[PDB]
């Protein structure tokens, strides 16, 4: 909870949002400050928002994007992965799809795949 | 300042220190997050210093190479130094040899001069 990095088990890459070029993605390598997110509990029990730069990570059924608006599609639940203690899938409430990656892009996927396992750890 | 099970990850490349007992393999890895990257960070017998342990062994520096130790020798004692412009990151300073935990390629090394590759974040594994 609070400021955190969001790192993928499969490749060690971290989600980032760069406001200076409006670039959302996943990056493997150096730990830049645009990889630091605000992970906050939402109004609805069991659901969270993932935010940077006054925007929220959302999935609109077509793309994973950043939203200025705290709307339904910004709600995510954590889903335990028993084989990998400390890792979670991030499941979008509205569209029931998992946060995933394809190359350097964040995507959503209803299938359960090895690239959907994330660890959220304190930035400071 | 995490105490207990943690990953030890480098700011410069996102790589994680690891020790695999079966393969007797110590290094840093920039790919997938495996179980053997989870360390036990504990307070030592001497205040101000910590041990860094896996598989009933301890990370040490003997003045030549960074290696594991079966026993908590003086060479297994490390202090934390905050990195001035990177809150959450630390240099790990070996007590006996005054050398900072560092890396070169896939290997852990130690260096007495402060450099850009010595910044570690120690984050809870669970
Ligand atoms: Cl960018
Ligand atoms: Cl980045």
Numbering used by the authors:
A (entry chain B): 6 to 129
B (entry chain A): 4 to 129
The paper states:
SeviL is a recently described lectin, of uncertain biological function, isolated from mussels. The β-trefoil fold shows pseudo-three-fold rotational symmetry, with three subdomains of the protein (called α, β and γ) that each contain four β-strands. SeviL is the first lectin to be described that shows an exquisite selectivity for asialo-GM1 over the closely related GM1, suggesting it may well be a useful tool in ganglioside research, and especially in studies of NK cells, which are currently of enormous interest due to their central role in the control of cancer by the immune system.
Gln 12 and Phe 126 lie close together, and their side-chains lie opposite their symmetry mates at the dimer interface. One chloride ion sits in a hydrophobic pocket formed by Phe 21, Phe 32 and Tyr 37; it comes within 3 Å of the side-chain of Asp 39, which also lies close to Arg 26 from the neighbouring molecule. Comparing the main chain atoms of a single subunit, the apo and liganded forms show a rmsd of up to 0.36 Å, depending on which subunits are compared, indicating that the protein shows no movement on ligand binding.
